[PDB]
């Protein structure tokens, strides 16, 4: 999954409504930022086998960090940071450890982004909620209701299939949301407003990249 362009990380602050001059109301997510988005490490095809750049995000007290990690960020000469992440480019010449990213440079207005985040955990969920199973009859004689159904065929094959859909734990995962739009950037509050919903509740941690378009931003294969 080679990624087009450097991304940045941010924090979901919650959603509000935002007008346009002509009275079109757009619901927008407001994505805040914190001190960070500092290039931590750079990986050369020679050295690592591939081309990538590790940006750290959330700053932090030095105590809370572990000695291996602190010693990772003193090799860089950067401030202590909670979350590290990698972006995979096809060319890294522009980047030095300790270099800083600004989201005002990378993202203009009306540009397309891709928001990766972690989803709301809904816990252990039934067949209905998890796979949209139609529920069986509520009344005439029927004892089933929200139950799973039959789970397989008869004597043959005589075992349930792999991956046959069943109740299990739902949510709480890395999820991409493709091709969103950027409505407004506030330099004052350093915030980015985005049309639509992004995963997870406020206080979340997001990763925004310039949108991969399978024809035109990416290696053909």
């Amino acid at each position: 999954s080679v990624d087009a362009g450097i991304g940045v990380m941010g924090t979901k602050l919650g959603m509000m409504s935002f007008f346009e001059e002509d009275g079109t109301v757009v619901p927008v997510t407001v994505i805040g930022f914190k001190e960070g988005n500092i290039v931590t490490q750079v990986k050369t095809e020679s050295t690592d086998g591939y081309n990538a750049v590790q940006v750290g995000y959330e700053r932090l007290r030095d105590r809370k960090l572990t000695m291996p990690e602190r010693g990772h960020l003193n090799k860089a000469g950067v401030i202590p940071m909670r979350h590290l992440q990698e972006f995979r480019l096809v060319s890294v010449d522009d980047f030095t450890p300790s270099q800083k990213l600004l989201f005002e440079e990378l993202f203009k207005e009306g540009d397309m982004v891709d928001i990766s985040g972690t989803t709301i955990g809904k816990g252990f969920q039934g067949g209905i909620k998890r796979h949209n199973f139609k529920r069986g009859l509520m009344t005439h004689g029927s004892k089933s209701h929200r139950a799973l159904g039959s789970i397989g065929a008869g004597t043959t094959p005589g075992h349930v299939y792999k991956g046959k859909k069943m109740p299990g734990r739902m949510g709480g995962t890395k999820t991409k949301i493709r091709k969103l739009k950027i409505m407004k950037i506030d330099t004052d509050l350093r915030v980015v407003m985005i049309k639509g919903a992004v995963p997870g509740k406020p206080g979340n941690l997001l990763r925004l990249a310039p949108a991969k378009i399978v024809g035109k931003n990416i290696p053909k294969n």
């Binding site: 094959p157 299939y161 792999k162 991956g163």
Partner: protein, 203 residues
């Protein structure tokens, strides 16, 4: 933490004593190289002449094994893989035993240049199955050889090795590389003998 308390000290000391006395009285190992019928010591031992010889642990020790290299360029897949299997299994040593690994290591290089007769390049079919229904996947030989060409020879030799514990443990002695180069130069590989006539194809 390794205790240097007099207790553990004492224990290791004693154990080296036991090991000493057990090494003194036991029969010496005489490796099989121009090894004559018997040493004046074995002659006091158990009967190894009128019973079938079976290898002891000093023999098959992994460090000793021959290494071999097959240039797979213009070789024919199957006919080569047989020879490879023979040598890996050990079937060419007088000391062969089914229950043990007496075999070699084999290094196969230039694994994309391997040659195959007939229309096979476009026909022979490597299938593997997920384990879900409709989990079947098929490759033509050639898609495979463009994508990860080592799998071809690995998969052709694995077929001719025994199956089961000694089989799998054997298969780890087959070291395959797509390039003309291998990083084993330290092991000093000899070249692999081929007594087969038809094994070498010419165009």
């Amino acid at each position: 933490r390794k205790s240097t308390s007099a207790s553990t000290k004492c224990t290791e000391e004693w154990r080296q004593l036991k090991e000493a006395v057990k090494k003194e009285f036991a029969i010496p190992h005489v490796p099989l190289d121009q090894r004559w019928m018997f040493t004046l010591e074995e002659a006091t031992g158990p009967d190894i002449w009128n019973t079938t010889w079976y290898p002891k642990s000093a023999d098959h020790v992994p460090t000793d094994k021959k290494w071999y290299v097959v240039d797979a360029t213009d070789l024919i897949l199957g006919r080569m893989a047989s020879t490879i299997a023979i040598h890996i299994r050990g079937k060419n040593l007088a000391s062969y035993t089914p229950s043990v690994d007496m075999g070699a290591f084999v290094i196969v290089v230039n694994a994309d240049k391997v040659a195959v007769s007939g229309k096979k390049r476009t026909q022979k079919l490597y299938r593997r199955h997920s384990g879900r229904p409709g989990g079947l996947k098929e490759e033509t030989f050639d898609q495979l050889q463009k994508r990860i060409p080592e799998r071809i020879i690995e998969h052709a030799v694995r077929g001719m090795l025994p199956k089961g514990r000694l089989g799998r443990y054997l298969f780890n002695h087959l070291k395959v590389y797509k390039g003309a180069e291998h990083p084993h130069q330290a092991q000093q590989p000899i070249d692999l003998p081929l007594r087969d006539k038809r094994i070498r194809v010419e165009k």
